[PDB]
Structure 1
């Protein structure tokens, strides 16, 4: 039997067998007042506190969210859908600790992605047990509010001030500060890591003065707050708060009265309308997201970054080889997971209308011009390949690289990777390549599990990723020092070195997508 005593009271966990040893897990410890009724859309309030043992033995409720139903029965997409009941009562966290219980261990805190409208910490590919077993770190993950329930904003007004889900995260980091010593963890050695919207969130915790003292270092996988999809302008957040009220028939006059109407609506009504508060959405749409609230975020983050107003520490930033491909099957014409999707020039041009709804004609011509100068054969997979590249370069790779240059210019060590292995188990077809989101299983160490049908080469690559990530958390240097591995150089402007991760040979390369990012970073902002 395993009871730990926290500030708010006692929690019981369970023991798990993992690769011949043991891990202790506490799944679903509460970390705030559930945000129900009167507390909907408000910031997260502090826990009432208890007596008796809370049984932290199963995953908790995932937060209310719309579900992906485009490929029912298909593992490639259902793997990202929630696997616990949905409910407004969802402010919970998970801890995995090594056994025997550590003395003063480093802590990794996961923050899931999901375009800020979805996600949950209880997914299979986020299971922290392997990291705890293998590297003797403690792993933590939290559930945070997504969609309007988490990011609806009417700024000033504390009834719905914006950024609620980010404060949910902040208060979870807080919990770790106060409580992790009891579980064996070092509150002075905490690394945040996250993917996609999770990576943008971690990047925003670097800007937030209220987060400065709640963590040590940061890992950003395929995401950063300067990505075009990451922050909503105060302007559009109003248009959207108002469009939702109109749609639910909640249109009031006094602003606090709108919010009050919205607190009576059952959560299904709110999810159902969320979808079209934008008049032209894309597969990348973030209906309800971070905003400049004047609390969590004090100014436009482009500005803070440019002028070096962030926490000074080491970062590890990286991206996948085919980030864009995954979004092409959610509505670009001529694309299918069930065929090779050879597309014509007309279909490419139309594809652009789907991804840059408006965006002028000249703007769109200029993307076509810079991505369709053929080198050369024809080569029918040519427009198919270009559209993938456009969506990945613009949304993921170029803003990651631009974040890294800017951050490092202020004197901190930065490390950049380019992940290029296609998983031998991927359920999406070949032409989709090394997809957005498919490094995660590598980082959490699933290929370490032999029954799992990964290749040996894949096991080796995972074990090495795990070591590098863990050395980063504990030391700020992501080397594999023992098995004669390639040394990972720091990223400076001027040279811009980065490391490639694959099953064959790791390489040191320079200036990823130099040509493409000159386009997105200096030309395109002006259209």
Structure 2
């Protein structure tokens, strides 16, 4: 029976057998006041204190959110849907510790993605027990509010200031500063990691001055805040908040009154109207996301990055070979998970209109021109592959490389990876390749479980990535030093070396997507 005294009271954990050893898991520890009633849309308030033993022995409620119903019964989509009850009462976190209790263990804090609209820390692919067993690190993950409930903004107004879910993440970081030594963690050795919006979130903590002292370093998987979906303009945030009001019958003249009305709405009515606050979305829409609130974020983040205003520390950044494919089967015409999706030029053109709705005709033609010069055989898959690369390059890969360059120019070591292994268990079809989100299970060490039907080469790839991540967190250097592995060189401006992660042979390469990213980075923003 394992009980830990925290600043707010006692917590009971549970023991787990993992690989012939034990991990102690504390699932569902609260770290804030439930944000209900008058607290809805406000910054998380600090926890009152309890007396008695809080039983942290099951995952807590996931935050309210819309759910992906495009492929019911299909594991490829459903694995990402929440696996605990939805409730506004969702501000909880999990702690996995090695057994016996470590003395001063490095801490890995996971921030999930989901577009800032969805996600929960209790998914199977985020289970931190394998990392605690194998690397003897402590792993922490928190639920944070998503959608309008997490990111509604009327900026400057403390009834709905914006970025509440980023403040939920920050308050969990603070909980780890105050409490983790009780669990055997070193509050001075904390690495944030996250994927997609969780990676964009990690990048914004590098920018936020109230996060500077809450962590040591950062890992960004397929996301960074300069991605075109990651930050909402003040203009679009106000418009969306008042669009939400209009839809829920909460248009008022005093803005504090709009929010008060919005506080009387059933959470379902808020969720049901979120999709419509925008005149046309895309599969990549982030209707309620981070804004420049003057609090968490003091200025436009592109300006902070460019002018070197961020935490000086090491970063590890990477992307997957086919980031954009997952999004094509949520509305691009001629695409389907259930066939090979050989599409025509006309379909490609229609697909750009689906992904680039506010963009001028010239803008869309410039994309077509950059991506359709083949290269050369015709090649029925030409247009199918180009559309996935358009979406992946624009939304994930070029912003990650641009973030990595600008960050490294200010003197800190940066390491960049390109993940190019397709999981042998992937339920999505082959044409979708190495999809967005499908390195995560390798990072959390799921293929280390021999009972799970991953191949032996995958068990080895995962073990090595697990070691590199842990070495990054502990030592700021993502090497695998014992097995004659390829040395991972720092990513510098000028050379731009990156490491490929694959089952066959790790390679050092240079200037990932050089020609494509010149297009998105220097020309497209003008269009």
Q: How many residues align?
A: 527
Length-normalised TM-score, structure 2 = 1.00
Which secondary structure does the structure 1 equivalent of 2:276 belong to?
Answer: coil
SS of 2:213's partner is helix
Aligned-pair distance for 1:91?
0.3
Q: What is the CA–CA distance in structure 1 between the aligned matches of 2:226 and 2:80, rounded to whole Å? A: 24
| Aligned counterparts of 2:48 and 2:508: Cα–Cα separation in 1 | 52
* Counterpart Cα distance in 2 of 1:187 and 1:523: 43
1:177-230 Cα distance to aligned partner (Å, 9 max, x none): 000000000000000000000000000000000000000000000000000000
- SS across alignment from 1:64: coil
Task: Give 1:517 shift.
Answer: 0.4
Aligned equivalents of 2:212 and 2:59: distance in 1?
29
1:411 Cα deviation from its structure 2 partner? 0.3
CA distance in 1, matches of 2:485, 2:48: 50
Q: After superposition, what is the alpha-carbon deviation per residue over 1:388-420, rounded to whole angstroms, capped at 9, x for unaligned?
A: 000000000000000000000000000000000
Aligned match of 2:182: 182
The 2-side partners of 1:138 and 1:521 are apart by 38
Deviation at 1:48, TM superposition (A): 1.0
Q: CA–CA distance in 2 between the matches of 1:358 and 1:481?
A: 49
**Secondary structure at 1:62's aligned position in 2?**
coil
SS of alignment partner, residue 181 of structure 2: coil
Cα distance between partner residues in 2 of 1:209 and 1:423:
38
| Aligned match of 2:103 | 103
Q: How far, CA to CA, are the matches of 1:156 and 1:514 in structure 2? A: 40
Mapped to 2, the partners of 1:20 and 1:156 lie a distance apart of: 53
The runs of 5 or more residues in structure 2 that have no matched partner are none
What do residues 35-73 of structure 1 show as CA deviations (whole Å, max 9, x unaligned)? 000100010001111100000000000000000000000
Cα distance per residue 1:425-459 (max 9 Å; x no partner) = 00000000000000000000000000100000000
CA RMSD of aligned residues (A): 0.3
Paired with 2:458 and 2:48, the residues of 1 have a C-alpha distance of 46
Counterpart secondary structure, 1:435: coil
Per-residue deviation, residues 112-154 of structure 1 (Å, max 9, x unmatched): 0000000000000000000000000000000000000000000
Work out the CA distance in 2 between the residues paired with 1:125 and 1:44: 27
> Could you tell me the TM-score, scaled by structure 1's length?
1.00
Distance 2:71 2:147 in 1: 22
Alignment of 1:312-391 (within 5 A): 312-391=312-391
Displacement after TM superposition at 1:8 (Å): 0.6
The whole-number CA distance in structure 1 between the counterparts of 2:438 and 2:8 is 38
What is the CA–CA distance in structure 1 between the aligned matches of 2:419 and 2:187, rounded to whole Å?
30
User: Which residues of structure 1 form unaligned runs of 5+?
Assistant: none
- For 1:304 and 1:422, how far apart are their aligned partners in 2? 36
Taking the aligned partners of 1:64 and 1:370, their CA distance within structure 2 comes to 41
Task: Give the drift of 1:374.
Answer: 1.2
Per-residue CA deviations over 1:314-347 (Å, capped at 9, x if unaligned) read 0000000000000000000000000000000000
The alignment partner of 2:114 has SS state of: coil
Q: Deviation at 1:84?
A: 0.3
Q: Distance in 1 between matches of 2:409 and 2:227?
A: 19
2-structure distance, mates of 1:461, 1:273: 43
Distance 1:411 1:53 in 2: 47
